[PDB]
Chain A
Amino acid sequence: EMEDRLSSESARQLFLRALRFHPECPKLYKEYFRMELMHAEKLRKEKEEFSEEILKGELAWIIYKNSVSIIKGAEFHVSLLSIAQLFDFAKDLQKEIYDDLQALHTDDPLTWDYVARRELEQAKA
């Protein structure tokens, strides 16, 4: 629907119905999260060629809170961040999710490791 027929709204219903059949599949949540961020890019370029809240990526941010609630996992929350970094727009969305990583997810080794590797990223030696 998206990449061929260019219909964002029809693809949304196919995703939303898919979650009711499979409420616990993380792959469905990540692809749905990615899909809305794709919808934001189409609208940003639409404005350049010629609603503010969606253009900020708020509509994808709703998915993030709900998905974290259903799937209480450290790896899944970090996974949603990876797609978020891939989209250049709305760095606050990447900032918001990253901040929640430390506060919400603690006492688990993976979260502390990710913070360490981010800091990693003759004089140059």
Chain B
Amino acid sequence: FLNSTKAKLLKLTSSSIDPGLSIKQLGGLYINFNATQIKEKKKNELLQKAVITPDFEKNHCVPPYSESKYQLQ
């Protein structure tokens, strides 16, 4: 995909043109063409916003699970 030309099939030059940046140097393509990286990031970012935290065992009283809208206001 990045380098699969028909000039490769018809060998007419000893070399090809090299773009410095590569797919592997980048994160890679978003899509696959044969028989997940962002979903790892969403999974990781969501885990960082977790109520189970460092010093969770240290806490003496757990914060309440759910509160009414009136009490929060």
Contact = CB atoms under 8 A, between A and B. Distances in A.
Interface stretch (B3-11, B33-41, B49-57): B3-11
Contact of B20 (A27, A34, A35, A45): A27
A3 interface: yes
A88 B12 CA distance: 13
Contact of B16 (A3, A27, A41, A45): A3
Contacts of B6: 3-4
Contact of A3 (B14, B17, B20): B17
A2 interface: yes
Nearest to B16: A3
B32 to A, nearest CB: 22
B66 interface: no
Interface of B: 5-8, 12-18, 20
B5 A31 contact: no
B45 to A, nearest CB: 36
23 contacts: A2-B7, A2-B17, A3-B5, A3-B7, A3-B8, A3-B16, A3-B17, A4-B6, A4-B7, A27-B20, A34-B15, A34-B17, A35-B17, A38-B17, A41-B13, A42-B12, A42-B13, A45-B12, A83-B15, A86-B14, A86-B15, A87-B14, A88-B14
Given A2-B7, A3-B5, A4-B5, A31 B12 contact: no
Interface string A41-83: 1100100000000000000000000000000000000000001
B17 A41 contact: no
Nearest to B14: A86
A42 B8 CA distance: 14
A86 B17 CA distance: 13
Given A38-B13, A41-B13, A31 B8 contact: no
